[PDB]
Design a protein around this ligand. Structure first.
Ligand SMILES: Nc1ncnc2c1ncn2[C@@H]1O[C@H](COP(=O)(O)OP(=O)(O)OP(=O)(O)O)[C@@H](O)[C@H]1O
Length: 152
RNA sequence: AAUGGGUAAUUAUAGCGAGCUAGAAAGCCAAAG
């Protein structure tokens, strides 16, 4: 808690610093549970649970501000079981193809052998990173919605 | 007693039965670019 209070003080809430706050949770709160007085939710960390809750809560707003509603107590608080059945979320994805054809393009008599092998598998890691972080600001979203990123 | 003859046994016994050092190096290539 003192690690939180030292870095939450001198801090600004904007898209410039929309992303340093997430690592402040994903490092510090990475092992702290959520709602410990329970019988089922024993393993959902507060770094992940706050990351998913902020991921959904933006997507309700982009689902509702496009349909044209402005009040939030009749389609959320009373029509909760209707929203439990209402399809309101996409699970997007992507798949970067041709990764090993690009990484393992090394051959005998390659003038840079291991440096190009360590660069190309890092290059496609940033490319798989930038496909995420450029789709989210083309939209109105950010790194909470990205549930995973890996090898493509 | 003379005289005629040799007869049987053993045919090697007990051990050691290989030990240690080396078990692929240097180039090409790749690296350095
Ligand atoms: N960035 C990466 N670096 C290293 N290895 C990777 C990377 N991305 C994927 N791989 C490895 O390559 C395998 C498959 O990669 P591939 O490019 O065939 O994916 P894919 O095209 O989605 O395959 P499929 O068409 O069968 O779904 C994975 O099992 C993974 O181990």
């Amino acid at each position: 808690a003192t690690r939180i209070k030292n870095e939450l003080a001198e801090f600004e809430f904007n898209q410039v610093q929309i992303d340093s706050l997430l690592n402040l949770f994903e490092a510090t709160l990475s092992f702290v549970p959520s709602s410990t007085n329970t019988k089922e939710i024993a393993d959902i960390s507060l770094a992940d649970h706050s990351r998913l809750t902020a991921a959904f809560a933006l997507a309700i707003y982009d689902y509702l501000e496009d349909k044209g509603r402005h009040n939030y107590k009749e389609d959320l608080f009373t029509k909760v079981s209707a929203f439990y059945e209402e399809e309101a979320f996409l699970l997007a994805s992507f798949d970067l193809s041709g990764i090993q054809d690009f990484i393992y393009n090394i051959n005998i008599a390659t003038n840079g052998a291991a440096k190009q092998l360590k660069a190309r598998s890092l290059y496609l890691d940033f490319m798989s990173e930038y496909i995420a972080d450029s789709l989210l600001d083309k939209l109105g979203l950010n790194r909470a919605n990205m549930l995973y990123v890996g090898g493509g």
